[PDB]
Amino acid sequence: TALVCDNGSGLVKAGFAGDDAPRAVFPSIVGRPRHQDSYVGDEAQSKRGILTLKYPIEHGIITNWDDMEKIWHHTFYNELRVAPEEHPTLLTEAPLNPKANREKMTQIMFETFNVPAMYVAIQAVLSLYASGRTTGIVLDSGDGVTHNVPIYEGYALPHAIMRLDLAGRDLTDYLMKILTERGYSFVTTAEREIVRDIKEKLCYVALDFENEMATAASSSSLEKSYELPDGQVITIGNERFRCPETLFQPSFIGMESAGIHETTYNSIMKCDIDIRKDLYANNVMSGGTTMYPGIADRMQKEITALAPSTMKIKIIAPPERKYSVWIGGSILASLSTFQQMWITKQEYDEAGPSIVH
């Protein structure tokens, strides 16, 4: 069985090709002791107070290879419990990943881990695959990074890719700002954890942000309560939707960027005119920070306001969307048609890391 490892900004999703879900999901982090000897994922939480905690793909591009190899070694030996030499491994990459980067990934797999074969796929591309389409425009918001990726006949159009350096860690931080400004105590990593859960449980995307601010101002009907373990109930009403409102208004955390509805629209307007009609009717959302209730509906209404009046627009938001990158990999990795596309160890010895292009 082939392996599928999605190298996410905050979490690794990995498992086997042919499966409907990943087997292992864990923070994309390496911890080394200071004293005196390596832990990854859940464990670099599970022994956190004696380590230096590294984040080798904070931002989505892999920044340190040592720590990255560590993440892979953990993923192969602890988490999937596999011999990497027995399995094809499909690896994911961020949109706009530097070629020296993709070659490096390839070098590590073959050289270090000794895989019989491998392949690098773009994350957003896989998510579009998971939604059974080969043309569409993907919004992928995950932990550390958001992109808009328009895709034609199976191939990202890298010149139209848009990037927003704001994603769900930035939203947790902001809920954390909000709540701490209200008098509450959230600093510790046991306490970010709480803020995250509050965000993941209660936050939603307003259909109309001012229409929603006024409902919160006039009745108590949007006020929800959350019990910290220390007994404290924290009541929130407008914060629920101010937090994810930042994807659309990046000014909320002091950023000068276009919001996601806008980057979606600019990205379409950088593609071929003759394929715009099909991006518009095939906007797919993916990644954990797309999970807010109302985001598809808001995205519909905003694009509508931007597009020409006659344009058929469709937003698609799979309930799997936290994991469609990975599912897309699992699908593609398992298809008969894909099997002549794997980069084989023979192919690597003969062509070098350059082959992966």
């Binding site: 409907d20 389409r133 199976g154 599912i327 699908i331 593609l332 298809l335 048609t337």
Partner: peptide, 21 residues
């Protein structure tokens, strides 16, 4: 020159059901 259509067809047509649980 030949590297899409059969792959295209399995992807679009793939039954997400047929996936191990």
């Amino acid at each position: 020159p030949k590297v899409a259509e059969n792959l295209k067809s399995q992807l679009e047509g793939f039954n997400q059901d047929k996936l191990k649980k």
